[PDB]
Swiss-Prot record, chain A:
PANTHER family: 50S RIBOSOMAL PROTEIN L32, LARGE RIBOSOMAL SUBUNIT PROTEIN BL32. Belongs to the bacterial ribosomal protein bL32 family. It comes from Pseudomonas aeruginosa (strain ATCC 15692 / DSM 22644 / CIP 104116 / JCM 14847 / LMG 12228 / 1C / PRS 101 / PAO1). This is Large ribosomal subunit protein bL32. Keywords: Ribonucleoprotein, Ribosomal protein. Residues 1-55 are annotated as: Disordered. InterPro entries: Ribosomal_bL32, Ribosomal_bL32_bact, Ribosomal_zn-bd. NCBIfam families: rpmF_bact (TIGR01031). One of its GO terms (molecular function) is structural constituent of ribosome. One of its GO terms (biological process) is translation. It holds the Pfam family Ribosomal_L32p. The gene is rpmF.
Curated annotation (Swiss-Prot), chain B:
GO terms for molecular function: rRNA binding; structural constituent of ribosome. Signal peptide: none annotated. The keyword RNA-binding applies. The lineage of its organism: Bacteria, Pseudomonadati, Pseudomonadota, Gammaproteobacteria, Pseudomonadales. InterPro entries: Ribosomal_bL20, RIBOSOMAL_L20_CS, Ribosomal_protein_bL20_C. This is Large ribosomal subunit protein bL20. One of its GO terms (biological process) is ribosomal large subunit assembly.
Swiss-Prot record, chain D:
Pfam families: Ribosomal_L17. One of its GO terms (cellular component) is cytosolic large ribosomal subunit. GO terms for molecular function: structural constituent of ribosome. This is Large ribosomal subunit protein bL17.
Amino acid sequence: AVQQNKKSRSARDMRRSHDALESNALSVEKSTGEVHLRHHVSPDGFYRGRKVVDK
Amino acid sequence: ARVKRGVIARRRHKKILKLAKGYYGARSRVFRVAKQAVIKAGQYAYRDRRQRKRQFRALWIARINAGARQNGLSYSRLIAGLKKAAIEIDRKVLADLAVNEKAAFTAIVEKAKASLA
Amino acid sequence: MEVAAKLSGARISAQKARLVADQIRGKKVGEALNLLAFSSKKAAEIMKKVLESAVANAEHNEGADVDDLKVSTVFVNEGRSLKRIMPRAKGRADRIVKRSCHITVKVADK
Amino acid sequence: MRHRKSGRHLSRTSAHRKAMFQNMAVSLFEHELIKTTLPKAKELRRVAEPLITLAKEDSVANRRLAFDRTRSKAAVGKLFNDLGKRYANRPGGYLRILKCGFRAGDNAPMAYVELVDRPV
RNA sequence: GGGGCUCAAACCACACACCGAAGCUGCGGGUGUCACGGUGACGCGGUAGAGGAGCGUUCUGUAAGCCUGUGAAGGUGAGUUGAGAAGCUUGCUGGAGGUAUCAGAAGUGCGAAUGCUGACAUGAGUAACGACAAUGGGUGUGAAAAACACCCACGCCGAAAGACCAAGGGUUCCUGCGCAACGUUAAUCGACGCAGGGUUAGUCGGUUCCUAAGGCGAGGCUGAAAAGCGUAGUCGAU
RNA sequence: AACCCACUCCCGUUGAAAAGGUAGGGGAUGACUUGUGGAUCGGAGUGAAAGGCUAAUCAAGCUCGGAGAUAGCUGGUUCUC
RNA sequence: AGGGGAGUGAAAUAGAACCUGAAACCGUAUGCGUACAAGCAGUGGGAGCCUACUUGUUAGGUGACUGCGUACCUUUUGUAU
Ligand SMILES: [Mg+2]
Ligand SMILES: [Mg+2]
Ligand SMILES: [Mg+2]
Ligand SMILES: [Mg+2]
Ligand SMILES: [Mg+2]
Ligand SMILES: [Mg+2]
Ligand SMILES: [Mg+2]
Ligand SMILES: [Mg+2]
Ligand SMILES: [Mg+2]
Ligand SMILES: [Mg+2]
Ligand SMILES: [Mg+2]
Ligand SMILES: [Mg+2]
Ligand SMILES: [Mg+2]
Ligand SMILES: [Mg+2]
Ligand SMILES: [Mg+2]
Ligand SMILES: [Mg+2]
Ligand SMILES: [Mg+2]
Ligand SMILES: [Mg+2]
Ligand SMILES: [Mg+2]
Ligand SMILES: [Mg+2]
Ligand SMILES: [Mg+2]
Ligand SMILES: [Mg+2]
Ligand SMILES: [Mg+2]
Ligand SMILES: [Mg+2]
Ligand SMILES: [Mg+2]
Ligand SMILES: [Mg+2]
Ligand SMILES: [Mg+2]
Ligand SMILES: [Mg+2]
Ligand SMILES: [Mg+2]
Ligand SMILES: [Mg+2]
Ligand SMILES: [Mg+2]
Ligand SMILES: [Mg+2]
Ligand SMILES: [Mg+2]
Ligand SMILES: [Mg+2]
Ligand SMILES: [Mg+2]
Ligand SMILES: [Mg+2]
Ligand SMILES: [Mg+2]
Ligand SMILES: [Mg+2]
Ligand SMILES: [Mg+2]
Ligand SMILES: [Mg+2]
Ligand SMILES: [Mg+2]
Ligand SMILES: [Mg+2]
Ligand SMILES: [Mg+2]
Ligand SMILES: [Mg+2]
Ligand SMILES: [Mg+2]
Ligand SMILES: [Mg+2]
Ligand SMILES: [Mg+2]
Ligand SMILES: [Mg+2]
Ligand SMILES: [Mg+2]
Ligand SMILES: [Mg+2]
Ligand SMILES: [Mg+2]
Ligand SMILES: [Mg+2]
Ligand SMILES: [Mg+2]
Ligand SMILES: [Mg+2]
Ligand SMILES: [Mg+2]
Ligand SMILES: [Mg+2]
Ligand SMILES: [Mg+2]
Ligand SMILES: [Mg+2]
Ligand SMILES: [Mg+2]
Ligand SMILES: [Mg+2]
Ligand SMILES: [Mg+2]
Ligand SMILES: [Mg+2]
Ligand SMILES: [Mg+2]
Ligand SMILES: [Mg+2]
Ligand SMILES: [Mg+2]
Ligand SMILES: [Mg+2]
Ligand SMILES: [Mg+2]
Ligand SMILES: [Mg+2]
Ligand SMILES: [Mg+2]
Ligand SMILES: [Mg+2]
Ligand SMILES: [Mg+2]
Ligand SMILES: [Mg+2]
Ligand SMILES: [Mg+2]
Ligand SMILES: [Mg+2]
Ligand SMILES: [Mg+2]
Ligand SMILES: [Mg+2]
Ligand SMILES: [Mg+2]
Ligand SMILES: [Mg+2]
Ligand SMILES: [Mg+2]
Ligand SMILES: [Mg+2]
Ligand SMILES: [Mg+2]
Ligand SMILES: [Mg+2]
Ligand SMILES: [Mg+2]
Ligand SMILES: [Mg+2]
Ligand SMILES: [Mg+2]
Ligand SMILES: [Mg+2]
Ligand SMILES: [Mg+2]
Ligand SMILES: [Mg+2]
Ligand SMILES: [Mg+2]
Ligand SMILES: [Mg+2]
Ligand SMILES: [Mg+2]
Ligand SMILES: [Mg+2]
Ligand SMILES: [Mg+2]
Ligand SMILES: [Mg+2]
Ligand SMILES: [Mg+2]
Ligand SMILES: [Mg+2]
Ligand SMILES: [Mg+2]
Ligand SMILES: [Mg+2]
């Protein structure tokens, strides 16, 4: 099936009112000061104040 | 002599689209829909120049009716008395006195009652 | 102040790229960069290079400081589109449009 | 429904699923630290942890059972000789899983599986 | 038509008042016909259709004129003027041409023709991403790696999904340098871009020798003309 | 079995495909299948005959001309008073 | 790739997809309206708010509430159909 009348500008923009994106949970590593995702290893290799992967 | 239509066609569309300002959707930005809206808006404007005279007279009557009954008289008995005495003030001025110059409206009403009508 | 930076012919659609652009409008430059560094969207990687260079333009050309700045203006315009052909069933052909956009970021101490 | 049901299909057949977790466990006992998807990392601890418990008692019966489950001669040698002796007094929980981010290619959540007391 | 209506807000007679149209009157304007020498009177819904009067566009004369870099046409706002098509004056853009008045000629006015050509919407960030043999780690390079290379381990074909001739194609083959577009994703990779290189025969396949079906065919026989058939002959591989 | 064919079901119908696929199915030393080259064609050819086939076109191919055929039939026909 | 300066030029919003650069279409910014309200989306009436200035018998923007109101073309005896 297909539309009988084309949708308007307002009709299609009302449908997109639920398309806004969310923001993640970012924490600051207390020892150094790097910003990482919450509950994730730092981009440097730190988690909860400990080297874990040494790059 | 070949004639090109580009320049006079553009001025003719722009006259219609300028009258369609403030309309909704395609009625103010595409010519085909805007032309019909401008024609229809001119039919209503012609017709509502007549209704405007009807709607205001009905408003004046409804307000003289309210003002006459505060003085103890209906609208139809007031008009009969006013024609009977001599008075020929408009309905537009009678409705204005009913709201603002209430002490002048009272004198006119008791003049109409004194005409035994 | 109001230093700008533009990226023309960004190889991504404007509707896709405008979802990211709404996240950083009016925010400070310091925190708008974190929000883009931890985003899964592809537009957030393209728009992170435009913002990072709009800050650099405010440094070399206007002697500003990163702390004072904030994203005063950001918008996404359309661009040229490439037109291709996609073969469908029963000998039919469809037209594919590959869309692009222009990304513009302005920073200002004001 | 799937009330009180255990396991993950992971869009693989049972033979594929069983064969993939052998490779991961065999690689883990050799490198001590691997990077995989988070859903796969959580299904691996139900395979690689019962193998370390089995190696705490060394006997012909146990090594044959371990080789039937990890068909790798080096992994049977690594167990019974390095692990199981290192973890001789650990009441379970021999591996640690840490979220690390998302892949560039498809945005899949990744993880780090490692052994708890690595020599590093 | 609804609310609601019972000495009615129903019905039957009588009476007085009011509401009520673009009808009639009052006031101010415009027009058609007729009459008189600006007044007077009667009119002024309208399809097919008949009759009358005009606006605007392109070119030619008026014009070796007039306007114009102290800013032409064109574009975009505002103000104003007519009963209308329309005219006029100015702000900004533009950067070199325009044409008063009165005449003459027309490729002379678009919303429709499942009209023609370009551009762009809605569906919609929706279906789909092409066999359901199958992938997991480590390392390297790199701006960046699920997909590139190497290693360890898994799977699949194996009278094929391996190898080789003929047809067909035509540089797709190898190396260095690249990633815009092409590859239904990314790409550092490629049958992609640029530049260089690469194919060696007495015996292999052709050509050369011989003919089949068939073709052409000196003379010839036939046929308005083009031409048809065919002898000697010479082409034609499977 | 290879090879040639197309009886049934389901899927697919904007298809992987302008006629396929997976499961079963018929013939399989012959009135068989197939490669290469050659012959017959538009009121003409060919046809174990279905008005079937003659380049995804067939109760008379395609292409260019007569040609802007003809259309008592549909559609459309552009500024103002 | 693309940009921010600096230079050339009378002029780079004349920058090589380069004179002018309209419309559909897509955005950012400001003013007002909009989440108890039913329909060709207008018009008659009309409050409040915002801006400008000659400070309210003015100009511009918006339009709460309310009376009336079923597009255009064609073909028809007749169409919101
Ligand atoms: Mg609909
Ligand atoms: Mg419709
Ligand atoms: Mg319909
Ligand atoms: Mg909007
Ligand atoms: Mg949405
Ligand atoms: Mg036009
Ligand atoms: Mg409006
Ligand atoms: Mg508009
Ligand atoms: Mg095809
Ligand atoms: Mg589209
Ligand atoms: Mg459970
Ligand atoms: Mg099996
Ligand atoms: Mg009674
Ligand atoms: Mg009247
Ligand atoms: Mg009248
Ligand atoms: Mg009069
Ligand atoms: Mg008339
Ligand atoms: Mg009349
Ligand atoms: Mg002239
Ligand atoms: Mg100027
Ligand atoms: Mg001209
Ligand atoms: Mg001008
Ligand atoms: Mg002007
Ligand atoms: Mg010149
Ligand atoms: Mg002239
Ligand atoms: Mg014409
Ligand atoms: Mg028209
Ligand atoms: Mg048109
Ligand atoms: Mg038409
Ligand atoms: Mg018309
Ligand atoms: Mg159509
Ligand atoms: Mg049309
Ligand atoms: Mg869309
Ligand atoms: Mg849908
Ligand atoms: Mg869905
Ligand atoms: Mg889907
Ligand atoms: Mg698939
Ligand atoms: Mg498919
Ligand atoms: Mg595939
Ligand atoms: Mg691998
Ligand atoms: Mg790797
Ligand atoms: Mg893959
Ligand atoms: Mg096998
Ligand atoms: Mg060849
Ligand atoms: Mg090539
Ligand atoms: Mg190659
Ligand atoms: Mg290379
Ligand atoms: Mg690609
Ligand atoms: Mg890239
Ligand atoms: Mg190449
Ligand atoms: Mg020979
Ligand atoms: Mg012969
Ligand atoms: Mg011959
Ligand atoms: Mg002869
Ligand atoms: Mg010969
Ligand atoms: Mg020969
Ligand atoms: Mg031969
Ligand atoms: Mg075959
Ligand atoms: Mg057959
Ligand atoms: Mg059949
Ligand atoms: Mg069948
Ligand atoms: Mg079946
Ligand atoms: Mg069979
Ligand atoms: Mg079959
Ligand atoms: Mg038999
Ligand atoms: Mg032949
Ligand atoms: Mg022939
Ligand atoms: Mg014929
Ligand atoms: Mg028959
Ligand atoms: Mg026949
Ligand atoms: Mg055919
Ligand atoms: Mg015929
Ligand atoms: Mg013919
Ligand atoms: Mg014709
Ligand atoms: Mg003829
Ligand atoms: Mg018509
Ligand atoms: Mg007109
Ligand atoms: Mg300009
Ligand atoms: Mg352009
Ligand atoms: Mg010039
Ligand atoms: Mg230009
Ligand atoms: Mg525009
Ligand atoms: Mg807004
Ligand atoms: Mg209520
Ligand atoms: Mg409300
Ligand atoms: Mg509604
Ligand atoms: Mg409604
Ligand atoms: Mg109103
Ligand atoms: Mg009004
Ligand atoms: Mg006002
Ligand atoms: Mg209203
Ligand atoms: Mg109504
Ligand atoms: Mg029609
Ligand atoms: Mg009919
Ligand atoms: Mg009928
Ligand atoms: Mg209707
Ligand atoms: Mg309708
Ligand atoms: Mg009707």
